[PDB]
Design a binder for this molecule. Sequence first.
Ligand SMILES: C[C@@H](O)[C@@H](C)Nc1ccnc(Nc2ccc(S(N)(=O)=O)cc2)n1
Length: 286
Amino acid sequence: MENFQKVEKIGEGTYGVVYKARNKLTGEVVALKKIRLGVPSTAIREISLLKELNHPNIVKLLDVIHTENKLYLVFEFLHQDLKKFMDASALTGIPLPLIKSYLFQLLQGLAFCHSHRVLHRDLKPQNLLINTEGAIKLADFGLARAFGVEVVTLWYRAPEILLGCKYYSTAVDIWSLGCIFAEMVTRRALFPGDSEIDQLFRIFRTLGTPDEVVWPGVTSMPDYKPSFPKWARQDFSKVVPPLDEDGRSLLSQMLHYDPNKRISAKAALAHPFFQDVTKPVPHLRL
Ligand SMILES: C[C@@H](O)[C@@H](C)Nc1ccnc(Nc2ccc(S(N)(=O)=O)cc2)n1
């Protein structure tokens, strides 16, 4: 902490406060995360694996500073988060070519992470960071599993997590990114639940209550109740106007109930929606 001069608080998360800060020696501007708490050995080792998980669409973890039994993560600083950008673009909407670019890049980032068996587990607009050059990057990648631990947003949570599955798969991240894709397009959160059951029931109201036909094994999950109401599925035509039919096909594959049926990041990259992908420049007010 002594090595940095705090500039301003930029986030408050489950695992600690994040500051924009400047390195006192070099003048580098960084994001400094003070991890909330000595540090268990296992957390140290998992975080140290994250230091080598480098990709253009993953926020670079510059240093892990484990001293005086405190843990600080030093990240490269990005200039804005997707939440703030979405809120800024709410009059006209993020142009589709930019949406498509951001989706494609995030899919590249996930394919890379997934290929190393690392999951995010908590994708949401506040953890997607953008720059002036057109890039978008996944932040706080791998921290949920490293640490294992003011209101938690449930809006992006996959249904298998809500239904009590103990072992997460890479599919949880595809589900979350699907939710975010929809939200960019419509300018409203797809499933804005305010409790676990409200989140589950908002999913069920839109995609239909899952059963053994669409999700074999669903009825044996830990928090599945035979008493859940049975709602009929809606058409994606009603869920995300004015997404074009390729966008809609791809979304539907990202939002399959059965995580085993849900598209992988790798497969998503070859989807016809990306045949005309480009990399536009956003208009950022900093
Ligand atoms: C991921 C989350 O913990 C975030 C706080 N972490 C990081 C990491 C690296 N860089 C940033 N920058 C940053 C963040 C938000 C904004 S905001 N809310 O003004 O759009 C402007 C810049 N944030």
